[PDB]
Design a protein around this ligand. Structure first.
Ligand SMILES: CN(C(=O)c1cc2c(C(=O)N3CCCCC3)[nH]nc2cc1O)c1ccc(N2CCOCC2)cc1
Length: 207
């Protein structure tokens, strides 16, 4: 298990997300489904020049898996996935600029719901989750587990769990007062409101 400090601006945004009073918490799901759709668009596009990139799985979809017993909401996609270098350096380097721009926009009157315009919508997961676990598998790398309970640090390890084939699985360990996001009717309403035109099948698993 390797422990890393988040870039200062990212840690700052995570504290702002956790500490700001903001009732419209449901936007976290739109943001995560969007990121899934982008990873799916990426593998679809790449497989046009290299069809072998779909050897790890041809199906392009999103699964929404609530678990009341574990108090977890899992968002699974069969997108391009992420390499170790993406999880540790690449995505965070880029997110540094988006994060700074977003925090400046909030100071100028913008709302937390506009987070996606700055490419840092992922951090909206901390509106509802005390801990986020990300399992990922890219064709060019091994399966990794990224994890953070905020507090300025995250961990990355090789994942010895069930092999994913290709894609990303976001496991949200929900805050005790955010269990409405495990309810089928609540998840259906959010998907219909914010993610109605996503170009991939979104399957909501029932318990
Ligand atoms: C390739 N890819 C993924 O496989 C993937 C990443 C996800 C995150 C996330 O953002 N993570 C999770 C781990 C810590 C870093 C952040 N959340 N849900 C995700 C679902 C996914 O399929 C990916 C997809 C979209 C993006 N951004 C969209 C917005 O513009 C900036 C790039 C970046 C990478």
């Amino acid at each position: 298990v390797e422990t890393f400090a988040f870039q200062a601006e990212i840690a700052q945004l995570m504290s702002l997300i956790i500490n700001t009073f903001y009732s419209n918490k449901e936007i976290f799901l739109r943001e995560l489904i969007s990121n899934s759709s982008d990873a799916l668009d990426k593998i679809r596009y790449e497989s046009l020049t290299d069809p072998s990139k779909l050897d790890s799985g041809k199906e392009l979809h999103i699964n929404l898996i609530p678990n009341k017993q574990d108090r977890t909401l899992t968002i699974v996609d069969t997108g391009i996935g992420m390499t170790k270098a993406d999880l540790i350096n690449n995505l965070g380097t880029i997110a540094k600029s988006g994060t700074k721009a977003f925090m400046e926009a909030l100071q100028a009157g913008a709302d937390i719901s506009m987070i996606g315009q700055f490419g840092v919508g992922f951090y909206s997961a901390y509106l509802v989750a005390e801990k986020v676990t990300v399992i990922t598998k890219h064709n060019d790398d091994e399966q990794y587990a990224w994890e953070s309970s905020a507090g300025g640090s995250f961990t990355v390890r090789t994942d010895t769990g069930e092999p994913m084939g290709r894609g990303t699985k976001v496991i949200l360990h929900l805050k005790e007062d955010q269990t409405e996001y495990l309810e089928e009717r609540r998840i259906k309403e959010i998907v219909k409101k914010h993610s109605q035109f996503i170009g991939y099948p979104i399957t909501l698993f029932v318990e």
